[PDB]
Amino acid sequence: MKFTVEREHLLKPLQQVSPILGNLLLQVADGTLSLTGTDLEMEMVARVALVQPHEPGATTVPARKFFDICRGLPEGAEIAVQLEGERMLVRSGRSRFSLSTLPAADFPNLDWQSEVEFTLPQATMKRLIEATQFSMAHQDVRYYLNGMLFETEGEELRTVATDGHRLAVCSMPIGQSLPSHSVIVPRKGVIELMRMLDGGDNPLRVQIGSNNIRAHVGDFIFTSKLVDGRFPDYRRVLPKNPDKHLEAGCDLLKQAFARAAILSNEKFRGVRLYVSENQLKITANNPEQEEAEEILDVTYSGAEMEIGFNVSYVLDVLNALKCENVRMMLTDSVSSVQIEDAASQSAAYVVMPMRL
């Protein structure tokens, strides 16, 4: 196995693909160098064209060491690789390296069949994930909440994320008629998928199987296993009939929350909201008996009520909305609230109240 390639062409591929699971699989075949990283749950494959003389073959090498070497070489560098027994030789200028190898044959492979396919701007996928990813659970015993629902319905792709205390849902049109379908992508997979998307205008092809998802953009192919379990139905989480409607400036609301939070309990940070005619009062207190109060002029209709919220849950929403004005739809002091950008119904958020 031999190739010579510009450092420049290896950088993004290496970034994307970065004991045998600490190794990258390198394969030369049909004028192409393919680089594959895997943790057994997911895999990333990047391809680089080879124009300079090359010889087919494959090995695996330490991923971080190999990446660090290539990134460590100067800009403009040319990188020459040859496989020599149990070692891989890497050469550029008067820099030389010999890396240990494990056989290509020992490298783990994820086959499976595609059931649902569609193309969409990578930008639309980014929007969907950014809108909801912060509401994923992290290490819940309910594994299926440690990730994100991808659902196709009509001509929309929808994401849903929840940790049982707050929920996020976002839908975007993809311009073609789709079968009704839903799968859970593990949180690590959502993160890796998001990292593959750079905000250029670039089509993304998505293929979904019974147990896998695959995404192709440019010269990259990401494949992950799915998480198998029953995801909650966002439609049963949305408040069925909120009759109290609050509208306020996004930034004013965010900053009032953040300031009041300073004097909340540091271990479980929440604030009390009192809504009344034209007005919102946010309050906090702590074990030192310190107290914060914020008063805001707001658009409000409905009965006066008091309700508490976890600060981080509300700030997380306001930070995802990046809105001018936000709508909060309330029911009563013991029910969850629905939060939305006053000027967009692409996304919605539902947050449990907190007792204080």
Ligand X SMILES: O=[N+]([O-])c1ccc2cn[nH]c2c1
Positions at the binding site for DNA: 64, 139, 143-144
Look at residues 314, 172, 307, 297 and name the one whose alpha carbon lies nearest to residue 247.
297
Q: Does residue 98 interact with a copy of itself by CB under 8 A? A: yes
Of positions 328, 336, 339, 341, contacts ligand X by CB under 6 A: 336
3-class DSSP state of 131: helix
Q: Does residue 243 interact with a copy of itself by CB under 8 A? A: no
Q: Does residue 114 interact with Cl ion by CB under 5 A? A: no
Q: Does residue 164 interact with ligand X by CB under 6 A? A: yes
Site for Cl ion in 48-77 (CB under 5 A): 48-49
Of positions 216, 232, 252, 258, contacts Cl ion by CB under 5 A: 216
Of positions 20, 49, 51, 100, contacts a copy of itself by CB under 8 A: 100
Of positions 39, 49, 95, 233, contacts a copy of itself by CB under 8 A: 95
Question: Toward ligand X, which CB reaches closer, 217 or 339?
Answer: 339
Pairwise CA distance, residues 16 & 203, whole Å: 18
Count of CB atoms within 10 A of residue 97's CB? 18
Q: Does residue 136 interact with ligand X by CB under 6 A? A: no
Site for a copy of itself in 259-288 (CB under 8 A): 259, 262-263, 288
Question: Toward a copy of itself, which CB reaches closer, 255 or 276?
Answer: 255
Q: Does residue 98 interact with Cl ion by CB under 5 A? A: yes
Selected range binding a copy of itself among 72-80, 119-127, 157-165, 338-346, rule: CB under 8 A = 72-80
Least distance from a copy of itself to the Cβ atom of residue 295, Å: 4
3-class DSSP state of 264: coil
User: Is the alpha carbon torsion for 29, 33, 38, 42 positive or negative?
Assistant: negative
Pairwise CA distance, residues 273 & 255, whole Å: 14
216 binding partner (options Cl ion, a copy of itself, Ca ion, none; Cβ < 5 to 8 Å by kind): Cl ion
Q: Does residue 63 interact with Ca ion by CB under 5 A? A: no
Instruction: Tell me how far CA of residue 6 lies from CA of 36, 49, 75, in angstroms.
Output: 19, 11, 9
Pairwise CA distance, residues 34 & 286, whole Å: 57
Side chain identity, residue 355? R
Order of all β-strands in the sheet with 220-225: 57-62, 23-29, 32-38, 42-49, 220-225, 212-217, 203-208, 116-121
Q: Is residue 328 within 8 Å of 343, Cβ to Cβ?
A: no
65 conformational bin, left if phi > 0, alpha if psi -120 to 50, beta if neither: alpha
Q: Does residue 94 interact with a copy of itself by CB under 8 A? A: yes
Q: Does residue 119 interact with Cl ion by CB under 5 A? A: no
Q: Does residue 171 interact with Cl ion by CB under 5 A? A: yes
Q: Is residue 206 within 8 Å of 214, Cβ to Cβ?
A: yes
Look at residues 258, 254, 273 and name the one whose alpha carbon lies nearest to residue 320.
254
Q: Does residue 44 interact with Ca ion by CB under 5 A? A: yes
Pairwise CA distance, residues 301 & 105, whole Å: 67
Of positions 97, 107, 220, 349, contacts a copy of itself by CB under 8 A: 97
Q: Which residue is nearest to Cl ion (CB)?
A: 216
Least distance from ligand X to the Cβ atom of residue 232, Å: 4
Q: Which residues would be at the binding site for a copy of itself (CB under 8 A)?
A: 62, 65, 68-69, 72-74, 87, 94-100, 255-256, 258-259, 262-263, 288-296
Q: Which residues would be at the binding site for Ca ion (CB under 5 A)?
A: 6, 8, 37, 44, 76
